[PDB]
Design a protein around this ligand. Structure first.
Ligand SMILES: O=C(O)c1cc(-c2ccc(F)cc2F)ccc1O
Ligand SMILES: O=C(O)c1cc(-c2ccc(F)cc2F)ccc1O
Lengths: 115, 116, 116, 115
């Protein structure tokens, strides 16, 4: 599992469950090509998005559908979604975890890149 | 000033100076049209992007060019940029501050929205 | 003004107003002596805690009373307070801004340090 | 394991390894009584701090020795340490994870409270 996403809720202090996540890869013409997608589990995590073979070097975008998440829990959110854009490189320690911590008017994201 | 951007550096404990910022607005045809751009000052602030008259209702994307920032300082950052996407002015004019706190592998963004 | 505190609310997208703040300085005997206190204004800022003359070298603790803040608004927060502990002025006088972004189960703090 | 601590490094995008963590419980006279301590593992995590039997309701402080961490990696840090102070309550979902994301001049902390 080369790419995992983890989402936390800063208002409730809990995993953010059932949040839709879409991953895109940048095409040569600069458009965003659908790559992988899913919904976070009960633990706020989304595993199995891709495989080593398919996850080649390139620029990727992870879109987290935060707006629907907040609305469903009776909060008025600011963002349309959270976006995380980065380059996957074969040099580094290439298990990538993209983590996001969500509030109605703020979010923080970090990358934990290991092996 | 209805739309301001402020950027801080969490490594240095200082404003993030000379950071490029590009703003886009989603057009009727659903693509991202250029709306405004600028660079942060020595205080890490960017004012004068737009006017109340031009800043109509819409979905806006504020792209903060963090990679170029970290690279010009000699770091090797993770993200290409920090992107903040939001609906604005859908209940009448508001004033928006978009604030970002940067580290090489992480960033946080918050919005302060005032004045109905 | 050598020491300022700014507090933002990530739930509302606004300044965090009327937040109590207590500052302490570690004394020779190694306990925390009261140093200054105040409350944030409608802009979420607290100025005038101390003067350059009084703000000597030392280890300082800035306690931001987040629990009382969330409770007065009717929330049930996790933390008792947010605490920021740092050495100040050990290379001569500096100006410190301590900034905090609050959610009920999380907070972030950053320092902007200027002016040698 | 009722209380776990996780520490991440925002500069390197990695777990913060070998970071000392001290937990204290507030005594009736308002002093901080040592409770548990350890060093984070290779995954940035510290497990086994306490047991269900010992972790009674009360106010606790988690001190993360961030200053030594940064110095050892050649960074000039701002904080003496990071402190997280909270009340443990028997009502809620009582597995507590205290997570901290560290930068030289900033840190963010969140609580993920589950069952
Ligand atoms: O901005 C972020 O993504 C962030 C992430 C965490 C964090 C906490 C616990 C964990 F298992 C992973 C995380 F990334 C903790 C604080 C934080 O700000
Ligand atoms: O995620 C963010 O947008 C963020 C913002 C700040 C902050 C600091 C100072 C300030 F004037 C405004 C800010 F939003 C401080 C920490 C932080 O994580």
């Amino acid at each position: 599992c080369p790419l995992m996403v983890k989402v936390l809720d800063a208002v409730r202090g809990s995993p953010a469950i059932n949040v839709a996540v879409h991953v895109f890869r940048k095409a040569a013409d600069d458009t965003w090509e659908p790559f992988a997608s899913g919904k976070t589990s009960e633990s706020g995590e989304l595993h199995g998005l891709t495989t080593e073979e398919e996850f080649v070097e390139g620029i990727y975008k992870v879109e987290i559908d935060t707006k629907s998440y907040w609305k469903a829990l009776g909060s008025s959110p600011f963002h349309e979604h959270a976006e995380v854009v980065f380059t996957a490189n074969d040099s580094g320690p290439r298990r990538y975890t993209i983590a996001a911590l969500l509030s109605p008017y703020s979010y923080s994201t970090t990358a934990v890149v290991t092996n």
